[PDB]
């Protein structure tokens, strides 16, 4: 079978700039956070472009 | 079925002093009220408060602390106790901590401090040591 290793993270409120900083400090391509001003769950990601994209869930 | 009330008072005060608490409350009495009234006159606590409730009205103590985060009451000891009551004449009525600390003593005038019992020339049951 295929085993998907889970990496647990606890969701936290921050700026998008902060999420970029923390994501780079781990080199992770995905960082999910709750937006500081919008209150919604946001996923900053690195595209295949190499540019950043922002998803709101 | 706690068996010594004003020793339970006196270790509530010690345990609040250890964790730097500034506010606790007691199930009170007359002798609990008037021991707590005599610590603010000597200057160990800040201010005692009212007695209000329907049954055995509580009172609050307001401990007092040094300006460099030190504590005023450093050590607090009940001396007379059930099973062995200690009584002192006014002649050998002892000075606490070379006259520094006090010794509140139940005499036949109401309870009084260590200083106020020799010049009054009365003795009685010596309740506790406060230092």
């Amino acid at each position: 079978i295929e085993i998907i290793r889970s990496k647990e993270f606890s969701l936290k409120p921050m700026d998008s700039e902060e999420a970029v900083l923390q994501m780079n400090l781990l080199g992770h391509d995905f960082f999910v956070f709750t937006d500081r001003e919008t209150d919604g769950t946001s996923i900053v990601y690195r595209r295949k472009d190499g540019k950043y994209g922002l998803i709101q869930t | 079925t706690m068996t010594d009330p004003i020793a339970d008072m006196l270790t509530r005060v010690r345990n609040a002093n250890m964790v730097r608490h500034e506010k606790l409350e007691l199930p009170a009495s007359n002798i609990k009220k008037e021991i707590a009234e005599i610590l603010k006159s000597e200057g160990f606590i800040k201010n005692v408060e009212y007695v209000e409730d329907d049954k055995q009205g509580v009172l609050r103590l307001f401990l007092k602390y040094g300006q460099n985060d030190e504590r005023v009451i450093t050590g607090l000891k009940r001396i007379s106790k059930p099973g062995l009551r200690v009584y002192a004449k006014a002649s050998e009525m002892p000075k606490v901590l070379n006259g520094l600390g006090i010794a509140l003593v139940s005499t036949s005038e109401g309870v009084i401090t260590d200083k106020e019992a020799r010049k009054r020339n009365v003795g009685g049951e010596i309740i506790a040591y406060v230092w």
Partner: protein, 156 residues
């Protein structure tokens, strides 16, 4: 300037597969006969260098000993683990009476007249620290009235 005084030197060997070890340690008491005393230990092999290792180690921890003159302010018992000294004030013409290790930590501050007795255990490491911990918890008459809020004459 500081006044050096030893307590004891010890001859300690730790067992090795080959030749065993030659560590000579020593504790000293450092004071100034005015109200400031510290202790410390020092581990070396050169014995006069093992002394001065302990002297400079005492220099980092000096405790201020409060004093009504010629004696100690009040009656205390020190505690550190098992060692426990007793400390009664005396008249100014009695002479300081004390045991082996506790005399050196009592002469190096200026008292020279107190009653004392080392209760409890016996090892010189603990009773010199159970005396400093006693002398740590002494209080003058003037600074208690600062905390208590009265004056020096109102306390009496």
């Amino acid at each position: 300037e500081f006044e050096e005084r030893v307590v004891t030197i010890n001859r300690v060997a730790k067992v090795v597969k080959g030749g065993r070890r030659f560590r000579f340690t020593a504790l000293v008491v450092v004071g100034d006969k005015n109200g400031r005393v510290g202790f410390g230990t020092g581990k070396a092999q050169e014995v006069p260098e093992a002394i001065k290792k302990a002297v400079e180690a005492a220099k980092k921890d000096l405790v201020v000993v409060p004093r009504v003159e010629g004696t100690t302010p009040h009656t205390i018992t020190g505690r550190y683990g098992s060692g426990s000294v007793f400390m009664k004030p005396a008249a100014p013409g009695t002479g300081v009476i004390a045991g082996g290790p506790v005399r050196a930590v009592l002469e190096l501050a200026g008292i020279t007249d107190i009653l004392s007795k080392s209760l409890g255990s016996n090892t010189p490491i603990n009773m010199v620290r159970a005396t400093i911990d006693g002398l740590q918890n002494l209080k003058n008459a003037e600074d208690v009235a600062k905390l208590r809020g009265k004056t020096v004459e109102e306390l009496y």
